[PDB]
């Protein structure tokens, strides 16, 4: 709550009781965690307008004044968005400082550093795409303000390069920069709500849980590769079987490589229907072979999952957890022991 | 379950269930953070397509919560990420995020299961139930009731 006040006090009085307290490694870690919580709250507050849902249909354009380009208001940056960009730039500057002061090769070794760099790069890409969309919208608005004088943007046939920016979301091109920005922003938000695990090892009750989860993921990856080979086997086989029945099937499953991938992946969680192998023609040989192959894939899924589960069970039953968490927490503490890091981002660019 | 610890056959079961719940709560918090991550992300992705989706999933915060929670038990359909417009970037990102959420669900559940397995394999159950039953008996030893 008082982070800007603490930053101002540290700036005006670096050497004081406040400065001495802030330089404490625990206080630096607390400030960094609080700064990221503010960032997460900023991301939530940015979408707070749509919490109960949008009040206008996606195919309807609502603007403020009649001479306004719709894409201008959709792509304009809010104050919360500008604060988000400032925060993202601050964390990017911190990551760049770490990269330059610790060598590019060693930086990629830590999973946290590469994950943070990827999340921030996706944020920069999303905001860049939104910036290009805003630039195009402002160009259309300038054209409207210059070569259009009718006080109403409803009876004037604007040129297509400017008429496109009056369309609603339904008429946007698939490669629209705002659509790319929104998708990348969603991915970046999901990745942003993952640096809470930067704070988890500090806690005694949740730190060991974080270490156990990380170890589980590390052992999970090997069995993911093992499952990937058999998954590819059945994907290619069922796609080959059903590619010739694109228009003669109950659904689109296994008609293309993407459809085969989707059906087989969602069969892991039971989200794929059994009608995916049903044909419309009376080719019972193909349909029965699809039934058998799908069933074998499902049983192989259970077998691989069971073998992985047995391996996880008989890989940890062999103080180890406490030492694991204490080592991770010691690394966290040592990251705040050195001089610097007194002011968390984005209050570090200055 | 006030009466269960008094019985010799069901008392230890009650104690084991209570211990399971106590260890469950920590992993519920761990799952809550990732659940909130995907809820906010998918809501942000799909909030602008309230009237352009097959169903209402991820259009609001409540809809995102409902879809993601019922994805735990497989009660949410895969059509929750399908759009009506030809915005394949948004639809494919929703597919990927929903799939990652499902895999993360399995990973968290598996890690919790491994922790439960390697937290009880280390007379303890009998002592546990007998202590609980002794507390039950002592509650009725005093005058009154
Ligand atoms: C890692 C390598 C794989 C390890 C796991 C292998 C599991 C094998 C188990 C298969 C269970 C049945 C896997 C097959 C399940 C088939 C499910 C189904 O609805 O099928 C319907 C059709 C039409 O009525 O059924 C047949 O047309 C024939 C059935 C009987 C097939 C028996 C042989 C199956 C596989 C043989 C190899
Ligand atoms: C605790 C932290 C998380 C731990 C678990 C992480 C699990 C990661 C595994 C992901 C499995 C696939 C998770 C994603 C599953 C996607 C399922 C699906 O139906 O997608 C359809 C779309 C359109 O055709 O597919 C793509 O558009 C691309 C696919 C291939 C994506 C590969 C990379 C996925 C994730 C990368 C990070």
Coordinates of C-alpha atoms and ligand atoms in Angstrom, one line a residue:
Chain A
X1 CA 0.0 0.0 0.0
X2 CA 2.8 2.4 0.9
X3 CA 5.4 1.4 -1.7
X4 CA 5.5 4.8 -3.5
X5 CA 5.9 6.5 -0.1
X6 CA 8.7 4.1 0.8
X7 CA 10.4 4.7 -2.5
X8 CA 10.2 8.5 -2.1
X9 CA 11.5 8.3 1.5
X10 CA 14.4 6.1 0.3
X11 CA 15.2 8.6 -2.5
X12 CA 15.2 11.7 -0.3
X13 CA 16.9 10.0 2.7
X14 CA 19.0 7.1 1.7
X15 CA 20.8 7.1 5.1
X16 CA 18.2 7.0 7.9
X17 CA 16.1 4.6 9.9
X18 CA 13.9 4.0 6.8
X19 CA 16.9 3.5 4.6
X20 CA 18.5 1.1 7.1
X21 CA 15.2 -0.9 7.4
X22 CA 14.8 -1.0 3.6
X23 CA 18.3 -2.3 3.0
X24 CA 17.5 -5.4 5.1
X25 CA 17.4 -8.4 2.8
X26 CA 14.0 -9.5 4.3
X27 CA 12.7 -6.0 3.6
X28 CA 14.1 -6.0 0.1
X29 CA 12.4 -9.4 -0.6
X30 CA 9.2 -8.1 1.0
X31 CA 9.3 -5.0 -1.3
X32 CA 9.9 -7.1 -4.4
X33 CA 7.0 -9.5 -3.5
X34 CA 4.7 -6.5 -2.7
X35 CA 5.7 -4.9 -6.0
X36 CA 4.7 -8.0 -8.0
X37 CA 1.5 -8.3 -6.0
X38 CA 0.7 -4.7 -7.1
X39 CA 1.5 -5.8 -10.7
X40 CA -0.9 -8.7 -10.5
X41 CA -3.5 -6.4 -9.0
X42 CA -2.9 -4.0 -11.9
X43 CA -3.5 -6.8 -14.4
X44 CA -6.7 -7.8 -12.7
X45 CA -7.9 -4.1 -12.4
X46 CA -7.2 -3.7 -16.1
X47 CA -9.9 -6.2 -16.9
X48 CA -12.1 -5.2 -14.0
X49 CA -14.4 -3.4 -16.4
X50 CA -15.4 -6.8 -18.0
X51 CA -15.8 -8.7 -14.7
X52 CA -19.5 -9.3 -15.2
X53 CA -19.2 -9.4 -19.0
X54 CA -19.2 -6.8 -21.7
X55 CA -22.4 -4.8 -21.9
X56 CA -22.3 -4.5 -25.7
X57 CA -22.4 -7.3 -28.4
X58 CA -19.1 -8.0 -30.2
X59 CA -20.7 -7.2 -33.6
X60 CA -21.9 -3.7 -32.4
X61 CA -19.7 -0.6 -32.5
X62 CA -20.2 1.9 -29.6
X63 CA -18.2 5.1 -29.6
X64 CA -18.1 8.4 -27.7
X65 CA -18.5 11.0 -30.5
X66 CA -19.8 10.4 -34.0
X67 CA -16.5 11.4 -35.6
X68 CA -14.6 8.8 -33.7
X69 CA -12.9 5.7 -35.2
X70 CA -14.0 2.6 -33.3
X71 CA -10.5 1.1 -33.4
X72 CA -9.2 4.2 -31.7
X73 CA -11.2 3.6 -28.6
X74 CA -10.6 -0.2 -28.7
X75 CA -6.8 0.3 -29.1
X76 CA -6.3 3.3 -26.9
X77 CA -4.1 2.7 -23.8
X78 CA -5.6 3.2 -20.4
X79 CA -3.8 4.5 -17.4
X80 CA -3.7 1.1 -15.8
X81 CA -2.3 -0.3 -19.1
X82 CA 0.5 2.4 -19.0
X83 CA 1.3 1.4 -15.4
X84 CA 1.5 -2.2 -16.6
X85 CA 3.9 -1.2 -19.3
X86 CA 6.0 0.7 -16.8
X87 CA 6.1 -2.3 -14.5
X88 CA 7.0 -4.7 -17.4
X89 CA 9.8 -2.3 -18.6
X90 CA 11.1 -2.2 -15.0
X91 CA 11.3 -6.0 -14.8
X92 CA 12.8 -6.2 -18.2
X93 CA 15.5 -3.7 -17.1
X94 CA 16.2 -5.9 -14.0
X95 CA 16.5 -9.0 -16.2
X96 CA 18.7 -7.2 -18.6
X97 CA 20.9 -6.0 -15.8
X98 CA 21.2 -9.6 -14.5
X99 CA 22.0 -10.9 -18.0
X100 CA 24.7 -8.3 -18.6
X101 CA 26.2 -8.6 -15.1
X102 CA 26.2 -12.5 -15.0
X103 CA 26.8 -13.6 -18.6
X104 CA 24.3 -14.7 -21.2
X105 CA 25.3 -18.4 -20.9
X106 CA 24.8 -18.7 -17.2
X107 CA 21.6 -16.7 -17.3
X108 CA 19.8 -19.4 -19.3
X109 CA 20.8 -22.0 -16.7
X110 CA 18.2 -20.9 -14.2
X111 CA 14.6 -21.8 -15.1
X112 CA 13.3 -18.7 -13.3
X113 CA 15.4 -16.3 -15.4
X114 CA 14.4 -17.8 -18.7
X115 CA 10.8 -18.0 -17.7
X116 CA 10.8 -14.4 -16.5
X117 CA 12.5 -13.3 -19.8
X118 CA 9.9 -15.2 -21.8
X119 CA 7.0 -13.8 -19.9
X120 CA 8.3 -10.2 -20.2
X121 CA 9.1 -10.7 -23.9
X122 CA 5.6 -11.9 -24.5
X123 CA 4.3 -8.8 -22.6
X124 CA 6.5 -6.6 -24.8
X125 CA 5.2 -8.3 -28.0
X126 CA 1.6 -7.9 -26.9
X127 CA 2.0 -4.2 -26.1
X128 CA 3.9 -3.7 -29.3
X129 CA 1.1 -5.3 -31.3
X130 CA -1.4 -3.1 -29.5
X131 CA 0.8 -0.1 -30.2
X132 CA 0.8 -0.9 -34.0
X133 CA -3.0 -1.3 -33.8
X134 CA -3.3 2.0 -32.0
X135 CA -1.0 3.7 -34.6
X136 CA -3.2 2.4 -37.5
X137 CA -6.3 3.5 -35.7
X138 CA -4.9 7.0 -35.1
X139 CA -3.9 7.2 -38.8
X140 CA -7.5 6.4 -39.7
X141 CA -8.7 9.0 -37.2
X142 CA -6.4 11.6 -38.7
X143 CA -7.8 10.8 -42.2
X144 CA -11.4 11.2 -40.8
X145 CA -10.5 14.5 -39.1
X146 CA -8.8 15.8 -42.3
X147 CA -10.7 14.7 -45.4
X148 CA -14.2 13.9 -43.9
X149 CA -16.5 16.7 -42.8
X150 CA -20.0 15.4 -42.2
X151 CA -20.4 15.4 -38.3
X152 CA -21.7 11.8 -38.6
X153 CA -19.7 8.6 -39.5
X154 CA -22.7 6.7 -40.7
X155 CA -23.7 8.1 -44.1
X156 CA -20.2 8.5 -45.5
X157 CA -18.6 5.7 -47.5
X158 CA -15.0 5.9 -46.2
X159 CA -12.2 4.3 -48.3
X160 CA -11.5 0.7 -47.3
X161 CA -8.2 1.5 -45.7
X162 CA -10.1 3.7 -43.4
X163 CA -13.5 2.0 -43.5
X164 CA -11.9 -1.2 -42.0
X165 CA -11.3 0.7 -38.7
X166 CA -15.0 1.3 -38.3
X167 CA -15.8 -2.4 -38.2
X168 CA -16.7 -4.3 -35.0
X169 CA -14.7 -7.3 -33.7
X170 CA -16.7 -9.7 -36.0
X171 CA -15.2 -8.1 -39.2
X172 CA -11.6 -7.9 -37.9
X173 CA -9.0 -9.9 -39.9
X174 CA -7.6 -13.0 -38.3
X175 CA -4.1 -11.3 -38.4
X176 CA -5.4 -8.2 -36.7
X177 CA -2.6 -6.7 -34.4
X178 CA -5.2 -6.2 -31.6
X179 CA -6.2 -9.9 -31.8
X180 CA -2.5 -10.9 -31.6
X181 CA -2.0 -8.5 -28.8
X182 CA -5.0 -9.9 -26.8
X183 CA -3.8 -13.5 -27.2
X184 CA -0.3 -12.7 -26.2
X185 CA -1.5 -10.6 -23.3
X186 CA -3.6 -13.6 -22.1
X187 CA -0.5 -15.8 -22.2
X188 CA 1.6 -13.2 -20.5
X189 CA -1.0 -12.8 -17.7
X190 CA -1.1 -16.6 -17.1
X191 CA 2.7 -16.6 -17.0
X192 CA 2.6 -13.6 -14.7
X193 CA 0.5 -15.4 -12.1
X194 CA 3.3 -17.9 -11.8
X195 CA 6.0 -15.8 -10.1
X196 CA 4.3 -16.4 -6.8
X197 CA 6.5 -19.4 -6.7
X198 CA 9.4 -16.9 -6.5
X199 CA 7.9 -16.1 -3.0
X200 CA 6.8 -19.6 -2.1
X201 CA 10.1 -21.1 -0.9
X202 CA 10.5 -18.3 1.7
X203 CA 7.4 -19.6 3.5
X204 CA 8.0 -22.7 5.8
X205 CA 4.6 -24.2 5.1
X206 CA 4.5 -23.8 1.3
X207 CA 8.3 -23.9 0.4
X208 CA 8.6 -27.7 0.7
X209 CA 5.4 -28.0 -1.4
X210 CA 7.1 -25.9 -4.1
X211 CA 10.2 -28.0 -4.1
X212 CA 8.2 -31.2 -4.3
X213 CA 6.1 -29.8 -7.1
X214 CA 9.3 -28.8 -9.0
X215 CA 10.8 -32.3 -8.5
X216 CA 7.5 -33.8 -9.7
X217 CA 7.6 -31.7 -12.9
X218 CA 11.3 -32.6 -13.6
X219 CA 10.5 -36.3 -13.4
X220 CA 7.2 -35.7 -15.3
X221 CA 9.1 -34.4 -18.4
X222 CA 10.8 -37.8 -19.1
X223 CA 7.4 -39.6 -19.1
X224 CA 6.0 -36.8 -21.3
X225 CA 8.6 -37.7 -23.9
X226 CA 7.7 -41.3 -23.5
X227 CA 4.0 -40.5 -23.9
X228 CA 4.8 -38.2 -26.9
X229 CA 6.2 -41.0 -29.0
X230 CA 3.1 -43.2 -28.6
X231 CA 0.9 -40.2 -28.9
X232 CA 2.5 -39.4 -32.3
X233 CA 2.1 -43.1 -33.2
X234 CA -1.7 -43.1 -32.8
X235 CA -2.1 -39.5 -34.1
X236 CA -0.4 -40.4 -37.4
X237 CA -2.1 -43.8 -37.6
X238 CA -5.7 -42.5 -37.0
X239 CA -5.1 -39.5 -39.3
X240 CA -4.0 -41.9 -42.1
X241 CA -7.1 -44.1 -41.4
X242 CA -9.6 -41.2 -41.4
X243 CA -8.1 -38.6 -43.7
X244 CA -10.2 -39.9 -46.7
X245 CA -13.5 -39.5 -44.8
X246 CA -13.4 -35.7 -44.1
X247 CA -17.0 -35.2 -45.3
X248 CA -18.2 -38.7 -44.3
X249 CA -17.8 -38.6 -40.5
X250 CA -20.0 -37.6 -37.6
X251 CA -17.3 -35.1 -36.5
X252 CA -14.1 -33.7 -37.9
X253 CA -11.8 -35.8 -35.6
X254 CA -8.8 -37.5 -37.3
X255 CA -9.6 -35.9 -40.6
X256 CA -6.5 -33.7 -40.4
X257 CA -3.3 -33.8 -38.4
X258 CA -4.6 -31.0 -36.2
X259 CA -7.9 -32.7 -35.7
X260 CA -6.2 -36.0 -34.8
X261 CA -3.9 -34.1 -32.3
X262 CA -6.9 -32.4 -30.7
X263 CA -9.0 -35.6 -30.4
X264 CA -6.1 -37.6 -29.0
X265 CA -4.9 -35.0 -26.5
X266 CA -8.4 -34.4 -25.2
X267 CA -8.9 -38.2 -24.9
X268 CA -6.4 -37.9 -22.0
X269 CA -8.9 -36.1 -19.9
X270 CA -12.0 -37.8 -21.3
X271 CA -13.1 -34.7 -23.3
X272 CA -13.2 -36.5 -26.7
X273 CA -16.4 -38.4 -27.6
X274 CA -16.5 -42.0 -28.8
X275 CA -18.3 -40.8 -31.9
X276 CA -14.9 -39.6 -33.2
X277 CA -14.3 -42.9 -34.9
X278 CA -17.8 -43.3 -36.4
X279 CA -18.2 -43.1 -40.2
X280 CA -21.2 -42.2 -42.3
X281 CA -20.5 -44.8 -45.0
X282 CA -20.9 -48.5 -44.4
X283 CA -17.2 -49.1 -44.2
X284 CA -17.3 -51.2 -41.0
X285 CA -13.6 -52.3 -41.5
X286 CA -12.4 -48.7 -41.2
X287 CA -14.8 -47.9 -38.4
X288 CA -13.9 -51.1 -36.4
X289 CA -10.2 -50.5 -36.9
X290 CA -10.7 -46.9 -35.6
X291 CA -12.6 -48.3 -32.6
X292 CA -9.8 -50.8 -31.9
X293 CA -7.0 -48.2 -32.4
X294 CA -8.8 -45.6 -30.2
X295 CA -9.3 -48.2 -27.5
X296 CA -5.7 -49.4 -27.6
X297 CA -4.6 -45.7 -27.4
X298 CA -6.8 -45.2 -24.3
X299 CA -5.5 -48.4 -22.7
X300 CA -1.9 -47.4 -23.5
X301 CA -2.7 -44.0 -22.0
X302 CA -3.7 -45.7 -18.7
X303 CA -0.7 -48.0 -18.8
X304 CA 1.7 -45.1 -19.3
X305 CA 0.0 -43.0 -16.6
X306 CA 0.2 -46.0 -14.2
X307 CA 3.8 -46.7 -14.9
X308 CA 4.7 -43.0 -14.4
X309 CA 2.7 -43.0 -11.1
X310 CA 4.5 -46.2 -9.9
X311 CA 7.9 -44.6 -10.8
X312 CA 7.0 -41.4 -8.9
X313 CA 5.9 -43.5 -5.9
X314 CA 9.1 -45.6 -6.0
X315 CA 11.4 -42.6 -6.5
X316 CA 10.7 -40.7 -3.3
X317 CA 10.1 -43.4 -0.7
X318 CA 13.8 -44.2 -0.8
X319 CA 15.0 -34.9 6.1
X320 CA 15.5 -34.9 2.4
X321 CA 12.5 -32.6 1.8
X322 CA 13.5 -30.3 4.6
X323 CA 17.1 -30.0 3.3
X324 CA 15.7 -29.5 -0.2
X325 CA 13.5 -26.6 0.9
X326 CA 16.1 -25.1 3.1
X327 CA 18.7 -25.1 0.3
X328 CA 16.2 -23.4 -2.0
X329 CA 15.3 -20.8 0.7
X330 CA 19.0 -20.2 1.3
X331 CA 19.4 -19.4 -2.4
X332 CA 16.4 -17.0 -2.2
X333 CA 18.0 -15.3 0.9
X334 CA 21.4 -15.0 -0.8
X335 CA 19.8 -13.3 -3.8
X336 CA 18.9 -10.4 -1.4
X337 CA 22.1 -10.4 0.7
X338 CA 24.2 -8.4 -1.8
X339 CA 24.1 -4.6 -2.1
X340 CA 21.4 -3.2 -4.4
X341 CA 17.9 -4.4 -4.9
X342 CA 16.7 -1.9 -2.3
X343 CA 14.0 -0.6 -4.5
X344 CA 12.0 -3.2 -6.4
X345 CA 11.0 -2.6 -10.1
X346 CA 9.6 -0.5 -11.6
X347 CA 11.1 1.9 -9.0
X348 CA 14.6 1.1 -10.2
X349 CA 14.9 2.6 -13.6
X350 CA 15.7 6.0 -12.2
Chain B
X1 CA -18.1 -38.2 12.8
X2 CA -18.6 -37.1 16.4
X3 CA -19.6 -40.7 17.0
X4 CA -17.2 -42.4 14.6
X5 CA -14.0 -42.4 16.8
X6 CA -15.9 -44.3 19.5
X7 CA -16.1 -47.3 17.2
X8 CA -13.0 -49.5 16.8
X9 CA -13.6 -50.3 13.1
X10 CA -14.5 -46.7 11.9
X11 CA -12.5 -44.6 14.4
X12 CA -9.1 -45.1 12.7
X13 CA -10.8 -44.4 9.4
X14 CA -12.0 -41.0 10.8
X15 CA -8.6 -40.1 12.0
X16 CA -7.0 -41.0 8.7
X17 CA -9.6 -39.0 6.8
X18 CA -9.0 -36.0 9.0
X19 CA -5.2 -36.2 8.5
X20 CA -5.8 -36.5 4.8
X21 CA -7.9 -33.4 4.8
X22 CA -5.3 -31.5 6.9
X23 CA -2.6 -32.3 4.3
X24 CA -5.1 -31.7 1.5
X25 CA -5.5 -28.0 2.5
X26 CA -1.9 -27.1 1.7
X27 CA -2.2 -28.5 -1.8
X28 CA -5.5 -26.7 -2.2
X29 CA -3.7 -23.4 -1.6
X30 CA -1.1 -24.5 -4.1
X31 CA -3.8 -25.4 -6.7
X32 CA -5.7 -22.2 -5.9
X33 CA -2.8 -20.0 -7.2
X34 CA -2.5 -21.8 -10.5
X35 CA -6.3 -22.0 -10.8
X36 CA -6.5 -18.2 -10.3
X37 CA -3.8 -17.8 -12.9
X38 CA -5.7 -19.7 -15.6
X39 CA -9.0 -18.2 -14.6
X40 CA -7.8 -14.7 -15.0
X41 CA -5.9 -15.5 -18.2
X42 CA -8.8 -17.2 -20.0
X43 CA -11.3 -14.6 -18.8
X44 CA -9.1 -11.9 -20.2
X45 CA -8.8 -13.8 -23.5
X46 CA -12.5 -14.5 -23.9
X47 CA -14.2 -11.5 -22.2
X48 CA -14.6 -9.7 -25.6
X49 CA -16.4 -12.7 -27.2
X50 CA -19.5 -12.9 -24.8
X51 CA -21.9 -13.1 -27.7
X52 CA -19.5 -14.8 -30.2
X53 CA -18.9 -18.2 -28.4
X54 CA -20.5 -21.6 -28.4
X55 CA -21.2 -21.3 -24.7
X56 CA -20.8 -18.7 -22.0
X57 CA -17.5 -20.1 -20.6
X58 CA -14.7 -17.6 -19.8
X59 CA -16.9 -14.7 -20.8
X60 CA -17.1 -13.5 -17.2
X61 CA -15.1 -14.2 -14.0
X62 CA -17.8 -16.4 -12.6
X63 CA -18.1 -18.3 -15.9
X64 CA -14.3 -18.8 -16.0
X65 CA -14.4 -20.1 -12.4
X66 CA -17.2 -22.5 -13.2
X67 CA -15.6 -23.9 -16.3
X68 CA -12.2 -24.3 -14.7
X69 CA -13.5 -25.9 -11.5
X70 CA -15.7 -28.4 -13.4
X71 CA -12.7 -29.2 -15.6
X72 CA -11.2 -30.8 -12.5
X73 CA -13.8 -33.6 -12.7
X74 CA -14.2 -33.6 -16.5
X75 CA -17.6 -31.9 -16.4
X76 CA -16.5 -29.0 -18.7
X77 CA -16.8 -29.5 -22.4
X78 CA -14.0 -28.8 -24.8
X79 CA -16.3 -26.5 -26.8
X80 CA -15.7 -23.9 -24.0
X81 CA -12.8 -22.4 -26.0
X82 CA -14.5 -22.4 -29.4
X83 CA -15.4 -19.1 -31.0
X84 CA -18.0 -18.2 -33.6
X85 CA -15.7 -15.7 -35.4
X86 CA -12.7 -16.7 -37.5
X87 CA -10.2 -15.6 -34.9
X88 CA -8.1 -18.8 -34.9
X89 CA -5.3 -17.1 -32.9
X90 CA -7.6 -16.5 -29.9
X91 CA -9.2 -20.0 -30.3
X92 CA -5.9 -21.8 -30.6
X93 CA -4.5 -19.9 -27.6
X94 CA -7.6 -20.8 -25.6
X95 CA -7.1 -24.4 -26.7
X96 CA -3.4 -24.4 -25.6
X97 CA -4.1 -22.6 -22.3
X98 CA -7.0 -25.0 -21.5
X99 CA -4.8 -27.9 -22.3
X100 CA -1.9 -26.6 -20.2
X101 CA -4.4 -26.0 -17.3
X102 CA -5.6 -29.6 -17.6
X103 CA -2.0 -31.0 -17.7
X104 CA -1.1 -28.7 -14.7
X105 CA -4.2 -30.1 -12.9
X106 CA -2.9 -33.7 -13.4
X107 CA 0.7 -32.7 -12.4
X108 CA -0.6 -31.0 -9.2
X109 CA -2.9 -33.9 -8.4
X110 CA 0.0 -36.4 -9.0
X111 CA 2.4 -34.4 -6.8
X112 CA -0.1 -34.2 -4.0
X113 CA -0.8 -38.0 -4.3
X114 CA 3.0 -38.7 -4.1
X115 CA 3.3 -36.5 -1.1
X116 CA 0.4 -38.3 0.7
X117 CA 2.0 -41.7 -0.2
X118 CA 5.4 -40.6 1.1
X119 CA 4.0 -39.0 4.2
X120 CA 2.4 -42.0 5.9
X121 CA 4.7 -44.9 5.0
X122 CA 7.3 -43.4 7.3
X123 CA 1.0 -48.5 15.7
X124 CA 0.8 -44.8 14.8
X125 CA -2.8 -45.2 13.5
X126 CA -3.9 -47.1 16.6
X127 CA -2.3 -44.5 18.9
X128 CA -4.0 -41.8 16.8
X129 CA -7.4 -43.3 17.1
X130 CA -7.0 -44.2 20.8
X131 CA -6.0 -40.6 21.6
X132 CA -9.1 -39.3 19.8
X133 CA -11.4 -41.8 21.5
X134 CA -9.9 -41.0 24.9
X135 CA -10.7 -37.3 24.2
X136 CA -14.3 -38.4 23.3
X137 CA -14.5 -40.5 26.5
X138 CA -13.1 -37.6 28.7
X139 CA -15.8 -35.3 27.3
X140 CA -18.4 -37.5 29.0
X141 CA -16.5 -38.2 32.2
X142 CA -17.4 -35.0 34.0
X143 CA -20.6 -34.4 35.8
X144 CA -23.5 -33.1 33.6
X145 CA -24.4 -34.1 30.1
Ligands
LIG1 C1 3.1 -49.5 -24.6 C2 2.5 -50.4 -25.6 C3 1.0 -50.7 -25.4 C4 0.7 -51.3 -24.1 C5 -0.8 -51.4 -23.8 C6 -1.5 -52.4 -24.8 C7 -3.0 -52.6 -24.5 C8 -3.7 -53.6 -25.3 C9 -5.1 -53.9 -24.9 C10 -6.1 -53.7 -25.7 C11 -7.6 -53.8 -25.2 C12 -8.6 -53.8 -26.3 C13 -8.4 -52.7 -27.3 C14 -9.5 -52.6 -28.3 C15 -10.8 -52.1 -27.8 C16 -11.9 -52.0 -28.8 C17 -13.1 -51.2 -28.3 C18 -14.3 -51.2 -29.2 O1 -15.3 -50.6 -29.0 O2 -14.1 -52.0 -30.3 C19 -15.3 -52.2 -31.1 C20 -14.9 -53.0 -32.3 C21 -16.1 -53.4 -33.1 O3 -17.1 -54.1 -32.3 O4 -14.2 -54.2 -31.8 C22 -13.5 -55.0 -32.6 O5 -13.5 -54.8 -33.8 C23 -12.7 -56.1 -31.9 C24 -12.9 -56.0 -30.4 C25 -11.9 -56.9 -29.7 C26 -10.5 -56.6 -30.0 C27 -9.5 -57.5 -29.3 C28 -8.0 -57.2 -29.5 C29 -7.6 -55.8 -29.2 C30 -6.2 -55.5 -29.4 C31 -5.3 -56.4 -29.8 C32 -3.8 -56.1 -29.9
LIG2 C1 3.2 -26.1 -12.4 C2 3.5 -25.5 -13.8 C3 3.0 -26.2 -14.9 C4 3.5 -27.7 -15.0 C5 2.9 -28.5 -16.2 C6 3.2 -27.9 -17.5 C7 2.6 -28.8 -18.7 C8 3.0 -28.4 -20.0 C9 2.5 -29.3 -21.1 C10 1.8 -29.0 -22.1 C11 1.1 -30.0 -23.0 C12 0.4 -29.3 -24.2 C13 -0.5 -28.2 -23.9 C14 -1.3 -27.7 -25.1 C15 -2.4 -28.6 -25.6 C16 -3.2 -28.1 -26.7 C17 -4.4 -28.9 -27.0 C18 -5.1 -28.6 -28.3 O1 -6.2 -29.0 -28.6 O2 -4.5 -27.6 -28.9 C19 -5.1 -27.3 -30.2 C20 -4.3 -26.1 -30.8 C21 -4.7 -25.9 -32.3 O3 -4.5 -27.0 -33.1 O4 -2.9 -26.5 -30.8 C22 -2.0 -25.5 -31.0 O5 -2.2 -24.4 -31.3 C23 -0.6 -26.0 -30.7 C24 -0.5 -27.4 -30.2 C25 0.9 -27.7 -29.7 C26 1.4 -26.9 -28.5 C27 2.7 -27.3 -28.0 C28 3.2 -26.5 -26.8 C29 2.2 -26.5 -25.6 C30 2.8 -25.7 -24.4 C31 3.9 -25.2 -24.4 C32 4.5 -24.4 -23.2

